[PDB]
DNA sequence: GGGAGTAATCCCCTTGGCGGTTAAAACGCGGGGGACAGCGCGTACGTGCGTTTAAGCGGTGCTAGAGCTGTCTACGACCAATTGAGCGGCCTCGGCACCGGGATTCTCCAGGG
DNA sequence: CCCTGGAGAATCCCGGTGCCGAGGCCGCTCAATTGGTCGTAGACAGCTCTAGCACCGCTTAAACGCACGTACGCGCTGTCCCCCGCGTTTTAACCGCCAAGGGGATTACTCCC
């Protein structure tokens with residue numbers, strides 16, 4: 090199919106069909122059907138690595154959504170590029186002030 | 192002992208705990224909590240009691256009420272953090288409406 | 302979806318066991334008569350032996366209690382179950398107390414047992430245990446949140 | 449109903465194969481995929497609106513416009529790899 | 537990410553040490569006392585409870 | 587219903603919010619503002635329930651209202 | 663001889679209070695952290711200073727990326743079509759769920775020195 | 776007073792039991808790129824264009840320091856309000872109870888083949 094020809098894991102034929110149905114502009118270059126798919130796989134792969142190490146931190150083989158929140162909230166860049174989304178099963182990272190605790 | 196009991200009662204004893212340490216332990220235990228806290232059934236009761244004003248026969252779904260609960264519950268917590276930081280910025284470790292109004296007028300209510 | 306979701310249970314075996322009661326009862330209503338005749342003698346014969354354990358128990362077990370305890374003793378020994386039918390007032394609680402005493406004295410096993418009785422009978426069972434076979438260490442259950 | 453469940457499982461096995469999943473995480477990752485895609489596409493279209501236009505370069509420059517450079521360099525490299533593989 | 541990996545590794549080593557020490561404690565406590573089944577002092581405990 | 591979020595519920599929400607001491611004249615205004623927010627979101631939800639005059643409200647409607655309200659939410 | 667609404671059966675499925683509970687919400691207060699009022703202080707800006715000073719002001723000679731045109735070719739729309747990525751019941755077994763077990767240290771009370 | 780014992784116990788992690796969960800297996804099933812053309816539009820030269828670069832150099836008005844000098848955030852203090860935790864009390868859903876309809880159909884009846 091399209092994945093073997095492109096040599097990429099995430100399907101791009103369906104993604105390119107969705108982009109064509111989008112019709113965002115008159116000139117839609119079809120030569121890169123997997124560019125957005127490539128960037129999303131890279132982002133999701135680094136997110137998955139962060140979530141995996143977070144889950145292995147607390148002897149949790151299965152990724153609890155709290156681990157996902159911790160993974161997406163422990164990095165300055167990740168919170169900078171999006172910080173206005175409230176994920177299900179919340180809970181901010183632990184914090185304390187120099188005045189509340191001795 | 193109110194009545195027949197395992198021998199002599201009153202084992203509870205005067206064991207009052209002073210605040211601060213109790214407050215610290217309860218906030219520490221509450222922070223790790225990640226699931227819903229307020230009762231959902233009164234929430235749906237109130238949201239249906241405040242939906243017929245627009246129109247009746249609107250009907251609802253579990254996904255809907257769940258999403259509104261998630262939206263309201265995950266938004267006021269950041270407000271609580273902002274109010275607490277504005278409070279301990281001044282010499283007021285307790286919360287009063289002054290710093291919450293401060294947070295409202297710095298977070299762009301309009 | 303509820304009807305289909307519940308329907309994933311089915312029944313596989315005794316639908317064939319019903320066949321011996323269909324038609325003109327086959328040659329199986331007579332077999333049921335013979336089965337009743339056989340089980341009468343089997344129940345009146347097997348393990349009706351008066352082998353009690355009158356130890357650790359306060360008081361005596363009545364004649365009906367004595368004749369009924371052996372049935373439960375056989376059920377335990379023969380690895381069989383049963384349902385006790387009795388008119389209230391004869392003291393099946395005393396039967397249970399005597400059975401527990403028999404298991405405690407005749408055999409070496411005591412074990413943590415479970416009793417499920419209506420809420421207004423918890424204290425009645427407690428004082429029955431206190432009055433008869435008090436050797437057992439009894440635990441109650443009130444105050445679910447803390448106690 | 450073409451979802452990304454198979455692709456998500458593939459990327460899971462690629463990154464952390466030993467790690468399992470929840471029953472609602474896949475919805476979160478699918479939302480990440482498609483919402484990032486549509487917002488990036490909308491920014492690209494709004495950027496191309498001014499210039500007269502009636503591909504790889506547009507997507508790459510849209511990525512470099514707003515998305516951080518730390519990720520933008522990797523995005524450009526992987527996009528070049530993908531387009532070269534497609535032309536291969 | 538490597539800091540998280542080494543933190544996880546040291547957490548695993550501490551968990552393994554706790555496993556070893558608690559398992560040793562449990563094994564020592566298991567073989568120290570086997571007396572609940574004797575059928576002799578049971579009369580004494582029954583009399584005390586009565 | 588005015589007393590939906592009751593006093594202990596608001597108290598434990600505040601404790602989850604990391605406050606040392608919570609005074610007894612702070613929950614009224616917080617309740618007022620959250621009721622205003624709830625009225626806004628339900629008004630939007632009923633508006634897009636009549637986008638196709640659908641006779642039911644679902645998660646799509648509320649996520650629409652919240653995503654155009656500026657307070658984006660995730661977990662779905 | 664043989665099949666389909668009508669009569670009938672199935673098997674819970676409805677219906678609404680209705681007892682009996684165990685989880686929460688709303689009480690009261692001794693003290694007790696928590697907020698608030700007074701007084702000095704000290705330092706560090708507000709200013710009115712004499713003194714340089716750096717963008718303004720006015721005009722210039724172009725010039726280097728910008729505005730801009732054919733145009734023509736690299737390239738964006740193009741519909742057959744087929745087997746493949748994948749999407750859907752299903753069905754198992756251990757990661758997770760929840761609670762007790764006991765050492766370290768967290769922490770506060772009764773002393774020792 | 777610092778230090779030691781002495782106990783409730785958080786946390787750790789392990790159990791210990793119950794379950795439901797990712798994905799494979801069977802089924803099939805919808806579209807991506809080949810295969811080509813229609814046109815088209817965006818960069819290759821060509822012309823140009825237009826005010827920006829930097830320049831000229833006084834000239835007030837920012838740079839810019841300093842002594843009077845006092846204003847109030849904060850150091851302490853006293854003065855003193857009501858947050859917070861132990862013991863009680865009043866709602867609240869939920870498991871059932873009860874019994875009269877629920878409803879597609881096919882399998883006696885009778886009308887179709």
Ligand SMILES: Nc1ncnc2c1ncn2[C@@H]1O[C@H](COP(=O)(O)OP(=O)(O)O)[C@@H](O)[C@H]1O
Pocket residue numbers: 363386387388389390391392393394395396
């Ligand atoms: N040995 C006894 N002495 C006095 N009362 C007895 C004795 N054995 C049984 N009972 C009575 O029998 C009652 C037991 O009731 P239960 O076991 O529920 O049904 P049943 O009435 O069939 O025994 C108790 O109320 C108890 O007072």
Ligand code: BEF
Pocket residue numbers: 386387388389390393
């Ligand atoms: F008749 Be009873 F209570 F067994």
